[PDB]
Amino acid sequence: QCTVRYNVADCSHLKLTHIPDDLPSNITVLNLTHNQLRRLPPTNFTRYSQLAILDAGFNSISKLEPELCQILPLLKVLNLQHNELSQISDQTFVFCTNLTELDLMSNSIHKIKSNPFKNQKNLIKLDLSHNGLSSTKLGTGVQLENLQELLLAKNKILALRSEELEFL
RNA sequence: AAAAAAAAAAAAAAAAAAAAAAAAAAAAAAAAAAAAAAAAAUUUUUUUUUUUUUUUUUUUUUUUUUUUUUUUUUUUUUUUU
Numbered sequence: 031q032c033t034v035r036y037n038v039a040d041c042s043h044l045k046l047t048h049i050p051d052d053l054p055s056n057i058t059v060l061n062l063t064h065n066q067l068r069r070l071p072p073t074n075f076t077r078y079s080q081l082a083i084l085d086a087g088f089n090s091i092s093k094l095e096p097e098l099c100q101i102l103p104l105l106k107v108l109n110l111q112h113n114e115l116s117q118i119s120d121q122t123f124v125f126c127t128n129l130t131e132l133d134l135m136s137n138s139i140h141k142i143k144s145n146p147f148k149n150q151k152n153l154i155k156l157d158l159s160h161n162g163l164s165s166t167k168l169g170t171g172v173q174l175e176n177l178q179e180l181l182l183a184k185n186k187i188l189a190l191r192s193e194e195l196e197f198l
Numbered sequence: 199a200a201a202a203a204a205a206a207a208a209a210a211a212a213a214a215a216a217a218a219a220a221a222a223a224a225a226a227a228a229a230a231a232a233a234a235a236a237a238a239a240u241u242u243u244u245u246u247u248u249u250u251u252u253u254u255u256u257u258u259u260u261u262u263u264u265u266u267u268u269u270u271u272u273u274u275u276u277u278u279u
């Protein structure tokens with residue numbers, strides 16, 4: 031099974047077909063990286079309500095439900111790089127107000143519409159790379175009050191314009 | 199038909215860090231060798247220059263004995279010119 035070992039559920043290569051929910055729910059760090067994930071269930075995380083951060087990376091997730099942002103209000107790091115994530119919207123980030131770290135290294139998110147990060151105020155680092163972005167625009171209004179580094183690499187942006195960089 | 203995430207096999211090529219070895223070369227340290235050389239301590243050869251002892255040849259010198267001649271100073275005696 032997983033490692034636990036004082037609140038670091040580092041679940042290595044273990045042929046875990048489904049997301050487990052074991053007795054040691056009193057942990058803060060959980061790692062779903064390198065685990066067979068069909069999708070993140072909006073209700074299977076009720077047992078683990080103390081997860082400060084979750085390392086659910088490189089998995090196979092079609093889309094993210096908004097409920098995941100309210101089942102774990104105390105969420106800091108959301109490392110979900112190398113997933114399918116064909117399309118995403120702001121609705122799934124409504125309740126993620128405490129989010130501080132985002133990692134999306136391969137998701138093929140070609141088009142981004144509206145303001146997906148209208149509720150993210152403590153989000154520091156943005157990792158949106160190799161997702162085939164054609165433009166650097168992320169919205170029309172002013173958001174991202176407190177962020178430090180913006181990662182937009184390996185995408186297909188053709189030019190930078192004043193109208194698409196005025197959202198900050 | 200095509201593109202991608204987790205899970206599993208992998209064959210090839212380019213690189214590397216190690217272990218077990220093996221020839222080759224080069225460094226030394228010990229056992230020998232063949233010699234062209236070097237002394238030293240025991241035998242002795244040839245040759246040159248010189249010392250001592252002993253046996254003898256030639257020449258010279260001294261003394262003694264014997265003997266032949268040139269000179270002799272004496273003549274005891276003998277017949278005399």
Ligand SMILES: *[C@@H]1O[C@H](CO)[C@@H](O)[C@H](O)[C@H]1NC(C)=O
Binds near residue numbers: 047049068070071074
């Ligand atoms: C969520 O939990 C249920 C009950 O254990 C399980 O059948 C299901 O597979 C879980 N979800 C995923 C995506 O595995």
